[PDB]
């Protein structure tokens, strides 16, 4: 019973590492994607306000 | 409606006042926190002799007046001149009569007990407001971001603060104050820009260095290999056109200015910087609450608006915090008004009615009543 | 040795589930964040082109 | 079913309450035996003013409350605060109304006559339970291991005991109490771990030393040449990852903590240790019953769960007992709930119905009735 | 004379080193326990490039160096920087060559075995002293007050301790350490004095708050009706003249600072205070020795010098101790050097010669020899 439970432990620990790495790479790609979404959505409100003032 | 419409929210700052009605999404009134006193006798065409000037008329006419700032580093230092800014806010800016409006005011982090009692004395006894309430600024900022536990890095015009808050109670012994903010930051840009070979000679040159700081300044992550980048000279440069043609270029200094917030040494300050201070606040708090504070670094204040401030802070504290920890730097877009918006929400709220200090409480308990 | 390895197995399997859920919630939040970043990056390339023509 | 379903079993401890329904295999409710009283006036968001807190809400909110333990060393010391823990158990934890449930309670080994009468007074007169019964703890532990004669080494959070039982009657004059248990043991680990060059500084560092003790601590047999082993430095070491990354390593101290149970001298205790005390209990009993007690050393309690406790005890008393004797140390896996399980069995039993003290017995005989 | 003259006594502290010759009445050398490392390359006029600075030259030149404290809370934390402070002590401060002087050193209450062996390794192997000896600090303080059994409340710059000693042997399991001392106390005064409406802005303002604490601070007995007294405003106030004219007034806060030692809650500390801790140490000791400890509360350390500390402690423990007991709080005048003086006495003593660890003992037994 012990040897079968050690083997299963090893396999689920390896899957848990393999997925924990995937989360961290997405979680980081996203602080990036959200930050470029926000740097983009500021530049505009300055350019669109700049548009409405130079149209006026 | 009696007071649903009727609650006022006045956030008193070192540089700006933000004011308006609880309910609104943003301040109806924003203006400098100055009180100008004319250096000479005379008049403007069509007006009478004016003893005093406040807000923008004091800024615009600054050449003939002696300008004074009532709030030094977030604390009210001159009460004669503050009652003047309040008067202006109610009567001219919001054009309301104060004696029928409940007023939510804000104070600073370790605001002396005696001050909270004094502005209550002036609110009730010289403005005769029905009821009032003083909220702590970081606490309204947090709450406006939905939560109740977190640590706010709050940074405006004269002060920076770290106020760790747990289930609403700001933690007195863990609060840190760093007297370097947006005011200090405009004057440093000034020098690195004259030092770029320039001259902000007339007052129309002075004022706009501040508009350069706001529009073009950045907080780079890896400020190290950003200077290095500056040198290879990429299309990192940025030219601004002055009141006239005089196109001034700012490439590099653009980020050397907010690197002052992480390195106070850029300005002859020996104090620690924003990120270390976030952290130190945190290793001054209870142990069990430190995972909470780390996942809830809420930013508020005009000077925390520099793009990429959050990414630099993100990486600044990850790399100081134990790896078992989750770091999370919340920086909302409306952050230059977080404080105010948190007050608008709270004061328009359904449950806040029972915390308003009324003239009944006051006339019966003395200023002590609201002081808590 | 068997009871300690069963307990560790149980705890790492529980962590593996708990993190696999976190990845899926981030991975989805991101198709959203990237898509709003792109719906944003088209309309201010349009509004800034509209700006440069009404400035000219 | 009337009461087959309906019998409650509440085991009151120095650290934990274990509670649930007679019939179940394990306690439905397990929680700290604290009652917190708020040090300041104020509220949590959305709740009202609370006068008191019990169990985990008292632990979680410990920074604003004064925590108090009603049971000192297994004996109820504060009856106002105990009625509070019972109230919480019935109404919130098990969510039952007590006035229709028979309640089996437990008491400690030489529990003063007057207490057994007082908790009966409170069970019947303030909770209005239909019927109740007080079992002695070691006696339920034994019985849950099937037998009726044996000696229980019982060890939990504030007390250790040896209760020799013969055909069900616990032997008053042979019972030994040693006031060093799991609570004492977590605080000693604490020091040998700070002494390993560490800091359990915030409250999130304090609490988890106890989770280190539970998960990684061992009772080595031949604790002598285990220290010797430590030195050659084998892969005996064991690193635990804290709330954050901060991987702490514990090699050796891992077993220096339960060696405290055999050597009280590790903690400035001059009393004898667990194994000697097992033995002394035994040479205080009748002669003819000593072979029985020796082949039936039943262990129960959270602190007897340290792996290899049984092997060390096995060899500890073989080598003190006359060689003509059979030693036998029974340590079941569910032992942190033996006491409770013994109560669940007994109270769900077919023959126990005729020992329940009913309100009829009480209203007619006074607290004396159940006292026996 | 060989060594009658020749024995050195070095007491290593968290804030100060006290040093001199066994025989003298007071330390020949007292100086900060810092090691400064220059932040920039350059020189003072007439000197060469200096890699390091120690004691007062590190304090005086602090603006261009990174200051570091080798002893954190009484324990040596950096051995590179400690060997630097020792070097400075022998060669510059006492101007002796160490290789012909026996050296009595002191260590802290539960100083890790390994440290006592390490400073022995450095004393004998890098300084080549003839012989040395490490005394425990509370133990030298007691002995300098004539006696051998008592309990010392020892409080300096980074730690407070209670060390119950019986016929010379400090009692390991009854010792209590409270990490709040004179350093913590100067920083709290700082805030209650800026909070009185002040500014300790330049470094010449910072340093002198500590000289205010030493000269004007008090420990009032009945700290209750001393605040009450403050309010009626008696001639309790006290103005100090700064480096310049700037006469600062301190009335009240004067005693609010040492009330921190009885109430750690003044500074966000949840630990118990000095008097309770004296007591708890005492109800952790053997029963038969508790009358002795109570009549012999010896005080030592810079922070126990606040006038009226003894009267407050006198009444603090009388009212916690059983009335059958005799309380007696000994606080001598030289107490900021008790530790040192106890070493001077002991090491100049006629009978101590046979406990000196000699290089013969060391070269033959390893660091283990002195470790005891």
Numbering used by the authors:
A (entry chain B), C (entry chain A): 112 to 167
B (entry chain K), D (entry chain M), E (entry chain L): 1 to 372
The authors write:
Column averages in the previous work had an axial resolution of 12.9 nm which is insufficient to reveal the helix of F-actin subunits; here the global average and all of the reassembled repeats show a zig-zag pattern of density characteristic of F-actin subunits indicating a resolution >5 nm. Significantly, we can now fit into the reconstruction an atomic model of the thin filament independent of any cross-bridge binding. We built into the global average of all repeats a single atomic model of the thin filament with 28/13 helical symmetry, containing 16 actin subunits, enough tropomyosin (TM) to cover the 16 actins, and four Tn complexes and then used that model for all the reassembled repeats. We estimate that the azimuthal fitting precision of the thin filament quasiatomic model is ±6°, which for a structure 8 nm in diameter gives a spatial uncertainty of ∼0.4 nm on the perimeter, assuming the actin filament behaves as a rigid body. Symmetrically placed about the target zone at the ends of the repeats are densities corresponding to Tn which show a 41.25 nm spacing on one side and 35.75 nm spacing on the other as predicted by the actin helical symmetry. The helical arrangement of actin subunits is now resolved, facilitating assignment of particular cross-bridge forms to specific actin subunits within the 38.7 nm repeat that spans from one Tn complex to the next. The present result, in which actin subunits and Tn's are resolved, and weak and strong binding attachments are distinguished, shows that the target zone comprises just two subunits on each actin strand, positioned exactly midway between two successive Tn's on that strand. The majority of heads, 78%, are bound to just four F-actin subunits, H–K, two on each side of the actin filament. The MD Cα backbone of weak binding bridges was not permitted to sterically clash with the TM backbone, which was in the high [Ca2+] closed position. However, strong binding heads inevitably clashed sterically with TM, consistent with their ability to increase activation of the thin filament by moving TM toward the open position.
